[PDB]
């Protein structure tokens, strides 16, 4: 009857104003702020636990707080970020183009949460009540969700300092692990440090470097003094990989995968020092002599790291071991560690290799050759089918995964005329319980 009489009904209250553009009111904003504030509160709680652990009152006055944190906050972070990776990962590069691009402030807060969780997990495994696995899973997933370019271009200086200090602390801790392993073959504090390394520190670095290399955000994530932090990490990882001990052996795999990830992610060709002069991404080229002297640098690209030898020297070593036919039991460390990092470096630097860019010659970072990758693949396959009769290991599958990208870059036809003889030579030893692709 209102319609018939013509009286037109409207809403009770016209909207006064729409505060839609502001991001602070958004659910993701509020949830991230909530998570950060609870993580920080747990941080000063663990500080009080540091002050009281030697003291009489070991029991938490904030027992409910710590148990709530461990049971709820960490798994909630895990599930939320696992479900919504794409929202944070989207950086105006159009992943999931339908919608859901995260605010830059929210990305800054994600990175700050990652830094805070790293600081919390640093040397506190014994402090955590068996929630160490949950915390390292949170670090893993959050490092996967981290977006580097957006924060680096537009981000708070405190966020810069937090990420840089987290990586610096990780580098210092792993350097101290290497030095105390070197000075003492035995295993206290050093035991808890090596437990921290092998349990949490190697996984977080491996995952972060894998993601950063995969998304190619390392270029701006590691430029200045974080580049030399990465230098220290690389030196320590290579020295541990070459290191000569039973504990380092039982941790072949963690150090090996971390070194492969670092080779994939790192933006300076450490294996080819002499050819980095033209590369602008070299910290020596960016710094110049004054900044090199201001920091702690030998000023020599070739002498930055003594333990890593020349790439050609490594290739000659690989080919001579392949010719000699060495065993896995005799000589495990190189075969577990060096080949994965070599393949990752292979794959990362084929882009700068002159094959993709014959133009702009002699500015190629590394003179990578198709015969070079094909020779490396031949050596790897030679070694694996030789060690096949030597009771082998899971490093069969590990090295197959590590060298699959190299096979992908290698031409089909150029791979052939060696592949089929190699494939059949594998076949008349393929008669084992494990099959290699």
């Amino acid at each position: 009857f209102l319609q018939i009489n013509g009286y037109a009904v409207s809403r009770g209250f016209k909207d006064l104003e729409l505060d839609t553009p502001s991001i602070e009111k958004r659910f993701a904003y509020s949830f991230l702020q909530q998570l950060i504030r609870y993580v920080d509160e747990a941080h000063q709680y663990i500080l009080e636990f540091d002050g009281g652990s030697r003291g009489k009152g070991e029991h938490f006055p904030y027992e409910q707080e710590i148990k709530f944190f461990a049971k709820v906050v960490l798994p909630l972070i895990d599930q939320y970020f696992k479900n919504h990776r794409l929202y944070f990962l989207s950086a105006a590069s159009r992943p999931l183009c339908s919608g859901g691009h995260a605010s830059n402030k929210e990305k800054e807060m994600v990175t700050s949460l990652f830094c805070k969780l790293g600081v919390l997990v640093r040397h506190r495994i014994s402090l955590f009540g068996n929630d160490a696995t949950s915390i390292v899973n949170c670090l893993h997933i959050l490092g996967q969700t981290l977006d580097a370019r957006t924060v680096m271009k537009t981000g708070l200086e405190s966020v810069k300092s937090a990420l840089r200090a987290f990586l610096d602390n990780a580098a210092e801790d792993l350097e101290k692990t290497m030095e105390n392993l070197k000075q003492g073959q035995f295993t206290k504090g050093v035991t808890q440090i090596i437990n921290y390394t092998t349990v949490a520190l190697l996984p977080m670095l491996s995952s972060l470097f894998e993601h950063i290399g995969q998304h190619q955000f390392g270029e701006d994530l590691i430029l200045e003094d974080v580049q030399v932090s990465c230098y220290r990490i690389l030196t320590s990882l290579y020295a541990l990989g070459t290191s000569k001990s039973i504990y380092v052996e039982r941790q072949r795999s963690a150090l090996g995968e971390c070194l492969a990830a670092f080779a994939g992610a790192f933006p300076v060709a450490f294996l080819e020092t002499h050819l980095d002069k033209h590369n602008i991404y070299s910290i020596y080229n960016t710094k110049s002599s004054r900044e090199r002297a201001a920091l702690s640098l030998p000023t020599n690209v070739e002498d930055v790291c003594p333990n890593i030898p020349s790439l050609e020297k490594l290739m000659e070593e690989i080919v001579e071991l392949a010719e000699s036919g060495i065993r896995y039991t005799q000589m495990p460390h190189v075969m577990e560690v060096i080949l994965p990092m070599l393949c990752s470096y292979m794959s990362r630097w084929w882009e700068h290799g002159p094959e993709n860019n014959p133009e702009r010659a002699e500015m190629c970072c590394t003179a990578l050759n198709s015969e070079h990758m094909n020779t490396l693949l031949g050596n790897i396959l030679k070694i694996i089918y030789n060690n096949l009769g030597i009771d082998e290991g899971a490093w069969m599958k590990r090295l197959a995964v590590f060298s699959q990208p190299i096979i992908n870059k290698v031409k089909p036809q150029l791979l052939k005329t060696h592949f089929l003889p190699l494939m059949e030579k594998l076949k008349k030893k393929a008669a084992t319980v494990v099959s290699e692709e």
Binding site: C97, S98, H101
Partner: protein, 337 residues
Amino acid sequence: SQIVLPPHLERIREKLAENIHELWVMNKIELGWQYGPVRDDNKRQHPCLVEFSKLPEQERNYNLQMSLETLKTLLALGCHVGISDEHAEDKVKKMKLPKNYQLTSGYKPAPMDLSFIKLTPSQEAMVDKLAENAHNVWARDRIRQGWTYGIQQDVKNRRNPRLVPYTLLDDRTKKSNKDSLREAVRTLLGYGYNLEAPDQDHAARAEVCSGTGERFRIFRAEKTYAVKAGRWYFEFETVTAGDMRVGWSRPGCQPDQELGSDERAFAFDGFKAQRWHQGNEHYGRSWQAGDVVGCMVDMNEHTMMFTLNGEILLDDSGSELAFKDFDVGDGFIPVCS
């Protein structure tokens, strides 16, 4: 007119008025026209190079409301005029001026060192919007004085080629607006009144511009050419990547209905990498321009398969078949949407 003028915008509008007069005299002296009572190109004279007081007041006012509309358009589009540094406002320095750049009169054309400030991609976007708006202003004026588009130039018929959208506009006029706005915005940035344009919004425009109700056109073979049994192959070549569906259809397919929405037809959508029959689910890979899609059906086994550039398309599952089972019915015919 909806935008109000704040007192701070007024006081910086004064400085922008000296900016615009300095720009007048600097542009004229650089381009070579001398100073004169009347604006004559043949005489090489410009009251613009002359002081603005001697400049005709109609041109003075026109360029004043020019500046006013420019500022209000910046505010409406989303920038927020704000003072950054009191010291920057207080300090005013003249650029070093050669004798040739020196103007005939005594009003030295130097707001500040414009080269000091740096540039933003958002600043490029909003400067481009300003240039497009200024070209629209000129075109709208010419419309209300009756000027129309013409391939040649004739004042008698009032036809001008420049009366076109800014997208097709000539590089000369585009560069004129571009460098004028470079000078203006760089001067404003030197003042410290940064223009904070709003962030870009994520949206899919969907490119739905087709006239009238039809959104897609379905092409099919004749019903009499239906295949009851056998193994059949035909190729669909996509010239441009986009919303296409290719597959096999029953003779009862409705042209108005979209392919694969109902039981009428089985289709493959490369735009979303989804196979279509009574709904959609992820299958295969998205094609590109110039790709060829081969449609293969086995009525004897009731199995139908697709290819993209000679490679068998795969489900999210390992099953190679696009559609596992279907009744033969009354045969299928080739179809595309």
